[PDB]
């Protein structure tokens, strides 16, 4: 190859030829704002970079074609990033989220590798032929750490170091190199952190570092330079280019920097998702976050039960497992103000209301197949609840004050509730019994009400002891209805019939705005307190703080694994009972058909038609 030196500065990535020593040219990119960490992939000569202003990781070819953003969510300060050229994996470290993560080079199958007791991981270096990765930490007590490249066997390699940067492996000579930003030194050690040596002690401000053949290269922010010296003696110092202020990173682009082999290089280890290098020449198959590795040690299966919780501009997933796996952002594009969420466990698709767009939208959990279900004539959806058997979304409309019903593919079913003085807000459906529950925020008269799923059999359950009942949940197994009142700052429950009303919690609650049932636990979100909390409906283990310091909480929704055999025993799950619009569970074990308020049931007693 032609050996190239690439460097980031401001919003540009530029290249200097190392055989001509002075030919400088910018990579023709658009949309970069703050270019930071750099790497490349030897097999296709793609370049990769992070951006601290956009909080993204992107890749492109050096002529600017195939510009793609491969990581776009869940980053804060992605200051370290490296390409695993053998397994075709992308690694990065974030000083904001305190995480080291991996994905495929196109961003698929993101997994969190290190997150516990991690204080600002900054500079990252990979050795996939051996199976180790190395990084510096800038938090608390700075240090250089080592782990397997599946995140296991984490150990401290260099304990006595300042904030360090430009961590670089000389793969040929088995040396580590870095700059110390607190002592302004360039140092080297062997792969075990031993045989330490100071390479240069007379540089005022060495920031970035890399290595190629007999030379180390660095940037100096006080000398506004990229410079080069003999990697063992520190001599033969030369100026690669001057008048370059604040160069954030430098990278030697040459195939000799990415050599070697591991099993991942040949058929990805027969791994379905990730092939991760593990120490001394090994490999292990890995899975996206919250997935599990099957008994064949090669294939991954998605989680069957989990918790979803939304913020203003993010939807997250949480699992309750022994590993205490971290929560993960879902990579759903174009969220602006998420107000409410739901999930279809049949087709495994997430649904949400965005009150900036006044839209109901849906996508798969990996963020693909984004689709608009409801859109504007002025609508303003407030809450939504899916009937998974008839395959309908029930949702409340704040502008027109109706309950409207829509098929999962966007075709409208119709409104089932409307009254001049009605203000339907929170809603949850119980298709197992044929009922729907909603809060009704009438002026000076808030209510909790229930009705059949076609709007008939409407009755007020509760009208006293309510100020702003803002969220509803229910559980068929427990046979219970749950609500939060953000004004009275308390959580209540009753039987689904409305009997046995009881306050569950009213202490240390500031602004409860959502709640959900997961097995025997009632979870809720406290917006003002920035917390998720849960309580045990059996009364045995009490009340637990699930996660704190979560800003802009908007909704929470638990997903239990679908019992497919049991699902298909619901009468409305088979062809909607033959009903064109609404299928009602009678309670006789039988089903009758019904219609939205603008249509009439026809003679076949299955079809709805336009009124005479």
């Amino acid at each position: 190859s032609e050996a190239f030196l690439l460097f980031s500065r401001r919003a540009d990535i530029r290249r200097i030829s190392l055989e001509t020593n002075n030919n400088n040219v910018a990579i023709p990119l658009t949309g970069v704002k703050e270019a930071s960490a750099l790497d490349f992939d030897v097999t296709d000569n793609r370049i990769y970079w992070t951006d601290i202003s956009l909080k993204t990781i992107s890749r492109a070819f050096m002529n600017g074609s195939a510009l793609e953003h491969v990581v776009e969510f869940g980053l804060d300060y992605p200051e370290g990033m490296a390409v695993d050229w053998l397994g075709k994996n992308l690694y990065w470290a974030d000083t904001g989220t305190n995480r080291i993560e991996v994905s495929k080079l196109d961003g698929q199958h993101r997994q969190v590798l290190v997150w516990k007791d991690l204080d600002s991981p900054r500079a990252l270096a990979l050795d996939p032929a051996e199976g180790f990765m190395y990084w510096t930490e800038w938090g608390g007590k700075p240090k250089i750490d080592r782990a397997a490249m599946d995140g296991s066997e984490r150990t401290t390699l260099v304990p006595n170091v300042g904030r360090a940067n430009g961590l670089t492996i000389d793969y040929a000579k088995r040396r580590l190199y870095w700059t110390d930003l607190d002592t302004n030194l360039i140092e080297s050690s062997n792969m075990l952190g031993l045989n330490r040596e100071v390479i240069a002690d007379d540089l005022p401000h060495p920031f970035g570092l890399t290595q190629y053949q007999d030379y180390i290269y660095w940037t100096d922010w006080s000398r506004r330079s990229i410079e080069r010296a003999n990697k063992t003696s520190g001599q033969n110092r030369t100026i690669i280019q001057g008048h370059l202020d604040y160069v954030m990173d430098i990278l030697v682009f040459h195939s000799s920097r990415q050599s070697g082999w591991n099993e991942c290089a040949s058929s990805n280890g027969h791994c379905s998702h990730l092939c991760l290098a593990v120490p001394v020449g090994g490999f292990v198959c890995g899975c996206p976050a919250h997935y599990s590795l099957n008994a064949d040690n090669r294939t991954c299966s998605a989680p069957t039960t989990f918790l979803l919780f939304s913020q203003k501009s993010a939807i997250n997933r949480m699992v309750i497992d022994e590993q205490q796996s971290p929560d993960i952002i879902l990579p759903i594009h174009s969220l602006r103000n998420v107000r409410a969420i739901d999930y279809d466990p049949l087709d495994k698709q997430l649904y949400w209301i965005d009150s900036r767009q006044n839209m109901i939208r849906k996508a798969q959990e990996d963020g693909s197949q984004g689709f608009t279900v409801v859109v504007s004539l002025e609508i303003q959806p407030y809450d939504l609840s899916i009937d998974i058997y008839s395959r309908y979304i029930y949702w409340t409309c704040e502008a027109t004050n109706v309950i409207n019903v829509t098929r999962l593919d966007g075709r409208s079913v119709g409104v089932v509730l409307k009254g001049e003085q009605d203000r339907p807000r929170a809603i949850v459906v119980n298709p197992e019994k044929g009922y729907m529950y909603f809060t009704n925020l009438q002026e000076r008269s808030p209510k909790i009400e229930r009705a059949a799923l076609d709007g008939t059999e409407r009755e007020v359950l509760f009208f006293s002891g309510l100020s702003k009942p803002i969220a509803l949940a229910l559980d068929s197994r427990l046979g219970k209805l749950f609500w939060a009142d953000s004004d009275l700052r308390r959580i209540e429950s009753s039987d689904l019939s409305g009997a046995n009303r009881i306050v569950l919690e009213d202490s240390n609650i500031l602004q409860p705005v959502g709640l959900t049932v997961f097995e025997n636990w009632l979870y809720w979100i406290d917006k003002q307190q920035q917390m998720i909390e849960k309580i045990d409906m059996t009364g045995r283990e009490g009340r637990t703080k699930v996660q704190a310091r979560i800003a802009q909480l908007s909704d929470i929704h638990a997903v239990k694994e679908l019992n497919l055999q049991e699902y298909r025993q619901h009468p409305c799950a088979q062809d909607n009972g033959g009903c064109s619009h609404i299928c009602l569970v009678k309670g006789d074990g039988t089903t009758r058909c019904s219609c939205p308020m603008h249509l009439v049931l026809l003679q076949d007693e299955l079809s709805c038609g336009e009124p005479p």
């Binding site: 401001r10 919003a11 704002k33 703050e34 930071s36 601290i52 202003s53 300060y77 200051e79 000083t95 202020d245 604040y246 954030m248």
Partner: peptide
């Protein structure tokens, strides 16, 4: 640009 400086640090062309 200049987010990194804002966290860890100023230069011109920043703000």
């Amino acid at each position: 640009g200049c987010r990194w400086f804002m966290k860890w640090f100023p230069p011109h062309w920043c703000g």
